[PDB]
Amino acid sequence: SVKIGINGFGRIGRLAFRRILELGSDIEVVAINDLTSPALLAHLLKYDSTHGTLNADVSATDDSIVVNGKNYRVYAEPQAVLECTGFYTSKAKSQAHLDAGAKRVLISAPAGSDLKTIVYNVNDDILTADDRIVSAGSCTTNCLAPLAFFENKEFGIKVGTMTTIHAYTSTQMLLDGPVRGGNFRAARAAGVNTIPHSTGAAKALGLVIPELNGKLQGHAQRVGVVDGSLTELVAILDKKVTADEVNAAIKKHTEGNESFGYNDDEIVSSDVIGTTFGSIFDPTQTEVTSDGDNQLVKTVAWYDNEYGFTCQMVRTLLKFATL
Amino acid sequence: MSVKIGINGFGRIGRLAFRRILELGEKSSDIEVVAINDLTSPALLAHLLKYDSTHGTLNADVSATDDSIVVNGKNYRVYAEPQAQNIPWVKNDGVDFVLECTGFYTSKAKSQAHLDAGAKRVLISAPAGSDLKTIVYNVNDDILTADDRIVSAGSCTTNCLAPLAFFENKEFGIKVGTMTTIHAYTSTQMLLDGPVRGGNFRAARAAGVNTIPHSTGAAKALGLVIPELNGKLQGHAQRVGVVDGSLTELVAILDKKVTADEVNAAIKKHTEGNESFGYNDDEIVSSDVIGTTFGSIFDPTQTEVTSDGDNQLVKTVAWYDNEYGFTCQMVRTLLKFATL
Amino acid sequence: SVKIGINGFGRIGRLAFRRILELGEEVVAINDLTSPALLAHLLKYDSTHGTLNADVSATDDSIVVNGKNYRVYAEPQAQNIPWVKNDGVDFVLECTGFYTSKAKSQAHLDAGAKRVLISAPAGSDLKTIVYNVNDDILTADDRIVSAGSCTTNCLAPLAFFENKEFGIKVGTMTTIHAYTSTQMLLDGPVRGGNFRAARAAGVNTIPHSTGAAKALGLVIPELNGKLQGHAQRVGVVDGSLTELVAILDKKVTADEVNAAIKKHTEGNESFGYNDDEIVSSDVIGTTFGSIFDPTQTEVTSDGDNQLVKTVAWYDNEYGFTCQMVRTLLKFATL
Amino acid sequence: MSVKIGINGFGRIGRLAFRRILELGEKSDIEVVAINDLTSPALLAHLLKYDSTHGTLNADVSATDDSIVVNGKNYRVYAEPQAQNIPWVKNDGVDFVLECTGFYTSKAKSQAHLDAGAKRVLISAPAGSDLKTIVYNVNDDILTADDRIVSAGSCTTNCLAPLAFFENKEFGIKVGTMTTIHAYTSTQMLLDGPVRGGNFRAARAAGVNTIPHSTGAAKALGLVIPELNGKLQGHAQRVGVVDGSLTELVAILDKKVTADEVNAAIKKHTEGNESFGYNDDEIVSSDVIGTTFGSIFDPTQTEVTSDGDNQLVKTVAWYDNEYGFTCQMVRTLLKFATL
Numbered sequence A: 001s002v003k004i005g006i007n008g009f010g011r012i013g014r015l016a017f018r019r020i021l022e023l024g025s026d027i028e029v030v031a032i033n034d035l036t037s038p039a040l041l042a043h044l045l046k047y048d049s050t051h052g053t054l055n056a057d058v059s060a061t062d063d064s065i066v067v068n069g070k071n072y073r074v075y076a077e078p079q080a081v082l083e084c085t086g087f088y089t090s091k092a093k094s095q096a097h098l099d100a101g102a103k104r105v106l107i108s109a110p111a112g113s114d115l116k117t118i119v120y121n122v123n124d125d126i127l128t129a130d131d132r133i134v135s136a137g138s139c140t141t142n143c144l145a146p147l148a149f150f151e152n153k154e155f156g157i158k159v160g161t162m163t164t165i166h167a168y169t170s171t172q173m174l175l176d177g178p179v180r181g182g183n184f185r186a187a188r189a190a191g192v193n194t195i196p197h198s199t200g201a202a203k204a205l206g207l208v209i210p211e212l213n214g215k216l217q218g219h220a221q222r223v224g225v226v227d228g229s230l231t232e233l234v235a236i237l238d239k240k241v242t243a244d245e246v247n248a249a250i251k252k253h254t255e256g257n258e259s260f261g262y263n264d265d266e267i268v269s270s271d272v273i274g275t276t277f278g279s280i281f282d283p284t285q286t287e288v289t290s291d292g293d294n295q296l297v298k299t300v301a302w303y304d305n306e307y308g309f310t311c312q313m314v315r316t317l318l319k320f321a322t323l
Numbered sequence B: 001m002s003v004k005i006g007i008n009g010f011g012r013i014g015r016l017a018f019r020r021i022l023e024l025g026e027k028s029s030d031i032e033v034v035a036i037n038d039l040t041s042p043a044l045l046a047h048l049l050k051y052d053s054t055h056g057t058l059n060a061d062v063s064a065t066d067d068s069i070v071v072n073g074k075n076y077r078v079y080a081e082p083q084a085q086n087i088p089w090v091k092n093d094g095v096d097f098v099l100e101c102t103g104f105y106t107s108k109a110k111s112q113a114h115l116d117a118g119a120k121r122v123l124i125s126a127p128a129g130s131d132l133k134t135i136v137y138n139v140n141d142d143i144l145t146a147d148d149r150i151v152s153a154g155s156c157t158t159n160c161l162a163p164l165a166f167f168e169n170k171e172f173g174i175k176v177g178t179m180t181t182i183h184a185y186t187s188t189q190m191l192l193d194g195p196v197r198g199g200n201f202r203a204a205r206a207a208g209v210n211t212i213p214h215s216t217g218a219a220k221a222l223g224l225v226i227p228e229l230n231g232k233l234q235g236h237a238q239r240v241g242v243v244d245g246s247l248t249e250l251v252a253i254l255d256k257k258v259t260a261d262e263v264n265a266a267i268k269k270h271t272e273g274n275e276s277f278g279y280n281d282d283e284i285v286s287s288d289v290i291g292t293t294f295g296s297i298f299d300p301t302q303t304e305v306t307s308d309g310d311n312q313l314v315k316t317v318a319w320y321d322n323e324y325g326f327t328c329q330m331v332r333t334l335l336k337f338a339t340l
Numbered sequence C: 001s002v003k004i005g006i007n008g009f010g011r012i013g014r015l016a017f018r019r020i021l022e023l024g025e026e027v028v029a030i031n032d033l034t035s036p037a038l039l040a041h042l043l044k045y046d047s048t049h050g051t052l053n054a055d056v057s058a059t060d061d062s063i064v065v066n067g068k069n070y071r072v073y074a075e076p077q078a079q080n081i082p083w084v085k086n087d088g089v090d091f092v093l094e095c096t097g098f099y100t101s102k103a104k105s106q107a108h109l110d111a112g113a114k115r116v117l118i119s120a121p122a123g124s125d126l127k128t129i130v131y132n133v134n135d136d137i138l139t140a141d142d143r144i145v146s147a148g149s150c151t152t153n154c155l156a157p158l159a160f161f162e163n164k165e166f167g168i169k170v171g172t173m174t175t176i177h178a179y180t181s182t183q184m185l186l187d188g189p190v191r192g193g194n195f196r197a198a199r200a201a202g203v204n205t206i207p208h209s210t211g212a213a214k215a216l217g218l219v220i221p222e223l224n225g226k227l228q229g230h231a232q233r234v235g236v237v238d239g240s241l242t243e244l245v246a247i248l249d250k251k252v253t254a255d256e257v258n259a260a261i262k263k264h265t266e267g268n269e270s271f272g273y274n275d276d277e278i279v280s281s282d283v284i285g286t287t288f289g290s291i292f293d294p295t296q297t298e299v300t301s302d303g304d305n306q307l308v309k310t311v312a313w314y315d316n317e318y319g320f321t322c323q324m325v326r327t328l329l330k331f332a333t334l
Numbered sequence D: 001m002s003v004k005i006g007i008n009g010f011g012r013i014g015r016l017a018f019r020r021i022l023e024l025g026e027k028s029d030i031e032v033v034a035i036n037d038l039t040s041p042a043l044l045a046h047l048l049k050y051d052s053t054h055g056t057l058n059a060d061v062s063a064t065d066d067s068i069v070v071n072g073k074n075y076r077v078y079a080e081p082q083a084q085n086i087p088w089v090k091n092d093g094v095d096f097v098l099e100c101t102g103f104y105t106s107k108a109k110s111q112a113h114l115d116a117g118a119k120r121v122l123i124s125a126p127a128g129s130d131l132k133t134i135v136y137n138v139n140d141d142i143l144t145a146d147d148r149i150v151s152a153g154s155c156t157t158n159c160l161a162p163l164a165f166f167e168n169k170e171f172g173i174k175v176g177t178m179t180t181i182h183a184y185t186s187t188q189m190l191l192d193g194p195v196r197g198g199n200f201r202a203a204r205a206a207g208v209n210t211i212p213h214s215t216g217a218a219k220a221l222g223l224v225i226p227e228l229n230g231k232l233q234g235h236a237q238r239v240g241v242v243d244g245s246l247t248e249l250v251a252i253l254d255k256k257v258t259a260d261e262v263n264a265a266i267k268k269h270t271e272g273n274e275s276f277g278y279n280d281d282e283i284v285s286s287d288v289i290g291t292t293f294g295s296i297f298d299p300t301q302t303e304v305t306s307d308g309d310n311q312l313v314k315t316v317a318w319y320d321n322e323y324g325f326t327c328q329m330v331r332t333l334l335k336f337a338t339l
C-alpha cells in the first residue's frame, strides 16, 4: 500500500475519495484532514447535490468516517498527501507534508513555476523519482492542454486566446457581498449572473507545453450551473485548414485516450457531469473563419471541472507509484 | 437635531437600509447616516451599494475613497473594525444610534459593545433573545419607550407572519397553528455542498439546486410580539432556489367556522391604508414582491378552508420581500425609536 | 411477454423505458411528435437523470438500444397508430398528457390495444391505482386504468398509514414541487390562460393548483372529502416534497407519529424512509413513490387542540415512474 | 404631431416596447395607440404589469374585453391573424407598425401592413437582404423617405454591430469570430423534450445547461457594415440566466495595438452614445438588465495576444438582449418621423 492523506475534504477531496474507491486496481486512501466534524464530512461524502448519492455504506465515529466497513481517520488540523484545500498552493506552503514523512505531495491546483505542473497524458512523462511536490494544474489546464497540444502538433499554433464558459465554484458567493480578496466580480451572486473571471491556464500553459510559452492568453465566464464547463480556443495556425480537417486530425488523438475524449452527439454541459476525461473534444463547434489568407480557427472541449479533473489527478497519483 | 446613525454590517440588510433611508428623502430627515463599519474596503462597499443583482442599480452617484463611500456628494465614513466596542464612530463621526446588521451581535450582551463604544441606542436587524423588546412595526411598536436602549427589529419571517396572525386571531381566534415559509435562499447558505458554520447537514447543501428544510423560530417565538399567541404556533422553512422573495403559509384551527371569502374580507379590512401589511389579489408570484415596501402582503387567492362536517382547517398565506420589505419595517421602527 | 406501446416519449415515457430496461428479468414500439433521431438522443442524454449506460442510436424509423430495435411513429391521433398490426402492441402505456380520460384513451382500444395504463389522473369512472396502497382492486376485467399523479403516489401511502394509525379527521397539503413541462421558461402566454402558469419557472416560487388531496378518496375511500391542498412550484428541475397538516382522532407526539409511520416503510419498495436530513436533489433517481422524512414531523398543541405535520419526499419523475411500472407489471400479467 | 405606433405581437418585445414608449411619454414624441395580438387582454394586461425580469410597471393597468387600460388611457387590442385586416390606421391613427410577432419577418410579408395603410413598418428581427437592416447609431443615416419596411436586425446584431464598426474604423478587421454568452430565451425548453425543428440542443433544459446555439448575426453583419461582409462568423452559448448577455469578439486587425490603445479608441466612440455605452466598473450580467443601450463596451475584458508578428484582439460588449434591443427599435421608430 501507498497510504494517502487527503488534506481538504471539499468538492475535490471527496471526489478523489470517490474515484479511488470506485477504482476497486489498488490505490488506497487511509486518512483525511479538514476544519469539520467527521459527521458532516461523512454526510457530504454520502450525499452530493451534483454527483448523486454514493452507492456505499457511509457512516461516522467521533474521529473518522467509515465506508463499507473500513475506517478512515479524520483530523481538524488547520496548519498542515493529496493537497486539496486551496490554502497550500505553492511549494513553500506545501512544505509540512514533506515535513512529516510523505514521499510526495500532489497539489490540486496551480502551485507556481518552481515545481512541475502535470497534465496526465500530455506531460506526465517528465515526472522523476526525485519529484516530491507536484502540481496537477487547474481544471482549466487539464481541459485546454490536450486540445492545444494536439492542435499545435498538427497545425502549429502561432497565437491563441481562450474563453472558458465555466460552472460556478466555491470561491464565489451565493448572494452579493464582501468576499475575501475584495474582487468586484467574485463578490457577486453566482447563480443569477454571468461573471467574468481571471484564469492563469492559457498564460501559464508553457509549464505543461514549453513551446506554447508566451503564445496564449484567456479568461473565464462563470455561469449559473453547478458543474460542467467548456473551453473555447481561437487560434492563428501555421497551416491553412478546414473544419472537417481540424476535426479529423484532433479526433485521432482521442482514440483510446482516457484523458482527452470525444463527443459528436451535440451534447450540453449537464452531459459531462460525472465523466472521467480531463477534456472532451466537441467537433460540432469547430469553426474556421477566413478572408483572403487571414484565418481564425475556433475549437472547443468540454470538461467536468470537478470529476474530470479529479480523475486526471488520480491518474497522476497512480503514476507516482511507477517512479 | 438629526439622530446620527452608524450602520454595522453593510450586507444585504445594511445596504438596503441605506437605500431605504436615502429614497425616503425628507421623510427620513429625522435621521442621518454618518458612518458604516464592515470587514472590507470602502471600494467594494461602494460597488455593492451601487450594483445589486436582486434590486438593480442605484440611481445615485456612488464612489469610494480610501476611507469612505460617497453618495450624491455626501460622505459616509467607513471602518473595518471586527470588534464593535472599538469602532470609533461616536467620537469621530457623532454616531448616536447603531443599526446593527452583521448577524454577529444578536443579543443584549453582544450589542452592549455598541453602548460601550458610546452609542446611546441600538436596533438589531434580527431576533435577539427574550430579554429585550422585539418590534414589528404596525403590530406592537407601541411598546417602545424613551428608556429602551437595545431593541430587536425581529426577523423577516416574524414581520411577515405577525400581522397575518394578529389580524386572523383578532377576527377568528387561533387555537393552534403551524407555519411553513417557502423562503429564498440567504447568505447563511452555501453555493455548493460543503462545510458550513454550525455543522448543520442541510445548511451545508447547494442552495440554488435544492429545496432545503430549515429551522425558524418565528412561529414558536411569536409571543414576544403577540403575547396571546404564545405557545400556540410552530413552524419551519423550506429554502428554495430564488435569490429573494418569500411566502409564509399558516394552517390553523380557528374558533369560528368560515369560508375563504369570509376570511379574506376580514383580513383585507386590516390592510386598508396599512403600509406594513398589504394586500394583493392579482395572482402574483415571488419575483413580484422583490422591491416592495410591506413587511407582509396578504394573498387572498391562496386562502383555503378544508372541512368535513364540523372539522375545519384554514390555510392563509402572505408574501414578503424578506430583504426589502423587512428593511422597510426596520426603517419604520428606526424612525420611531430614534426620535423617542 | 406482453408487448407495450409507449404513447408519449416525454419525461415519463422515456423514464418508463429506462426503468423497464434496468429491471432486466416489454417495450416494442413508441409514438410521439418527433424524429426517431431526437427520441434516441433524449433517451440517451438526460439533464436530470444523466446519461444512459447503454449503446443508443437511431435508424430512419426506430430507436436502437444495445442492438435491439424499437419502432417509432409520429401520429398525433392515437386511433391512427398502426402498432398493433405492425409491432404486436397489446398494452399502451399512455404518457402524453392528452388522453387523460376513459373517453379519450378509448382511441387506443379502437387502434386495437387490449389495455391502457394512463400516466396521470383520468377521472373517477375508472380505477386509480397507487401501487402498495390499493393495487389489489385490479381485476382481469379492467381495460383502462389510472396510475394516478406523481403527487397522489407521494401523498397516498403517507395519508393511508397515518389514517390507519391515528385517524385523519381533516387535512391539507402543500407540495413544494419541481417545475414541470407545463410551465414556461420566461413570462408569456400559456395554454389555459392562467396568470401563474404564465410566469418564468426558474426564478419564481409559483402557486399551482393540484387535485391529489381532493381526489384522494379514489384511492383511499375513507379519506374522500377530508383533504384539500395545493402546490408551490419552485426553481429546481426535479425532486419534490409533500407536507400534510392534519387534525387526528388520537392525541400524539412527534416520536409516536414517527415510529408508527416508519413501521409501514419496513421492506416497502413504494413508501420508503430517510432520516439523514436529506434535501431535494438526494431523491432524484430514487425508486420510491414516497419517502417519509421523520426529521420534519411536528406536533403543535395548546390544551386539547392539536395539529400534526408530516412530510414525504418524492422524485416526481422517476419515483412515480417506478410506481407506474410496478402497476404495469401487475396489470399486464392478469 | 406625435408619432403613433401600432404594435403587432404583444410578446416580451412588444410589451417592453410599450413600456419604453410609455416612459418616454413622461416627457421626443411617440405614443402607442393600438395593439394586435391573439391572447386575451386580461392576460396581456397582467404580463404588462408584472414581469419576472423587468419588475412591476409603476402604472395603473387593467383590462376590458377588447383593450388594456393604463393610467386611464384605453389601448385597443385587435385580434386579427392577418395583418392586412388590422384597422388601426383609420381607427386609431397608427403611423408606423412595430412588427414583433415573428411571422412577418420579410419585406413581402410585412407589405400586409402597408396594405392596411401603415406608412412604415419596423420588424423586430432579421428580415432578409432586399430591405435595409438598421442598427441605430451605426447606419440609420442610410434610411430615406422610400424606406417603408425596415429590419432592426437581431438583439445580437445590435450588440455586435457598434463594437465591430468602431473597432474596424479604428484598426481594420481582417477576420473575426464572435461568441455571445447569452441568456436563455422563449425558444428554449424548461425541461429536456421534443422541440420544434428537432434540434438536439434546442431540446435541452435551459436553466441547468450551457447550450451551444447557432447565430447569424456575425455572418450577416455585411447588411449593416458592408466592408465586414464575409469577414466574421460566430455562435452563442445559452446560459442559465433569464436576461442579460455579452458578446466576445476575437479579431485579426490591420494594425499592431496594445490593450490600452484598443480601449481608448473604442471608448471615445461610446462617449455620449445612447446606443453603444461604456462600463468600466467590473459589472456582471444582471447589471445590464433594464439598461437602454444596444451594446455596452467593457474595457476590463480586452485582451491583446501577440507573438512576434501574429496578433489576436479580444473585445467584449454587454447587452440587455431584451430592453437594449427594444430601446434601439424605439430610436429607429422616432427616426422614421424625420424621413
Ligand SMILES: NC(=O)c1ccc[n+]([C@@H]2O[C@H](COP(=O)([O-])OP(=O)(O)OC[C@H]3O[C@@H](n4cnc5c(N)ncnc54)[C@H](O)[C@@H]3O)[C@@H](O)[C@H]2O)c1
Binding pocket: A007, A008, A009, A010, A011, A012, A013, A033, A034, A035, A036, A077, A078, A079, A084, A085, A086, A087, A089, A108, A109, A138, A139, A169, A170, A305, A306, A309, B194, B195
Ligand atoms: N471545484 C473545481 O471545479 C476545481 C477543479 C480543480 C481544482 N480545484 C481546486 O481544488 C482546490 C479545492 O477546491 P474545492 O472546489 O474542492 O473547494 P472546497 O471549498 O469545496 O474545498 C475546500 C476544503 O478545504 C477545507 N479547508 C480549508 N482550509 C483548510 C485548512 N487550513 N486545512 C484543512 N482544510 C481546509 C475546507 O473546509 C473545505 O472542505 C482549490 O485549490 C481549487 O482551485 C477546484
Ligand SMILES: NC(=O)c1ccc[n+]([C@@H]2O[C@H](COP(=O)([O-])OP(=O)(O)OC[C@H]3O[C@@H](n4cnc5c(N)ncnc54)[C@H](O)[C@@H]3O)[C@@H](O)[C@H]2O)c1
Binding pocket: A177, A178, B008, B009, B010, B011, B012, B013, B014, B037, B038, B039, B040, B081, B082, B083, B101, B102, B103, B104, B106, B125, B126, B155, B156, B186, B187, B322, B323, B326
Ligand atoms: N437577508 C435577509 O433576508 C434578512 C432579513 C432580515 C434579517 N436579516 C438579518 O440581518 C442580519 C444580516 O443579514 P444579511 O443577509 O444582510 O447578511 P450579509 O451577510 O449580507 O451581511 C452581513 C454583513 O456583516 C459584515 N460583518 C460580519 N461580521 C462583522 C463584524 N464583526 N463587524 C462588522 N461587520 C461584520 C459582513 O462582512 C457582511 O457585509 C442577520 O442577522 C440576518 O438574520 C436578514
Ligand SMILES: NC(=O)c1ccc[n+]([C@@H]2O[C@H](COP(=O)([O-])OP(=O)(O)OC[C@H]3O[C@@H](n4cnc5c(N)ncnc54)[C@H](O)[C@@H]3O)[C@@H](O)[C@H]2O)c1
Binding pocket: C007, C008, C009, C010, C011, C012, C013, C031, C032, C033, C034, C075, C076, C077, C078, C095, C096, C097, C098, C100, C119, C120, C149, C150, C180, C181, C316, C317, C320, D193, D194
Ligand atoms: N413530469 C412529472 O413529474 C410527471 C409525473 C407524473 C405524471 N406526469 C404526467 O405524465 C404525463 C406526461 O408528462 P411529462 O412530464 O412526461 O411531459 P412531457 O412534455 O415531457 O412529455 C409529453 C410527450 O408527449 C408528446 N405528445 C404530446 N402530444 C402528443 C400526441 N397527440 N401524440 C403523441 N405524443 C404526444 C410530446 O411530444 C412529449 O414528448 C402528463 O399527463 C403528466 O401529468 C408527469
Ligand SMILES: NC(=O)c1ccc[n+]([C@@H]2O[C@H](COP(=O)([O-])OP(=O)(O)OC[C@H]3O[C@@H](n4cnc5c(N)ncnc54)[C@H](O)[C@@H]3O)[C@@H](O)[C@H]2O)c1
Binding pocket: C188, C189, D008, D009, D010, D011, D012, D013, D014, D036, D037, D038, D039, D080, D081, D082, D099, D100, D101, D102, D103, D105, D124, D125, D154, D155, D185, D186, D321, D322, D325
Ligand atoms: N424574446 C426576445 O428576447 C427577443 C429578442 C430579440 C428579438 N426577438 C424577436 O422579436 C419577435 C418576437 O419576440 P418576443 O420575445 O416578443 O415574442 P413572444 O413569444 O414573447 O410573443 C409573440 C406574440 O405574437 C403574437 N402573435 C402571433 N401570431 C400573430 C398574428 N398572426 N397576428 C398578431 N399577433 C400575433 C402572439 O399572440 C404573442 O403575444 C420575433 O421577431 C423574435 O425573433 C425576440
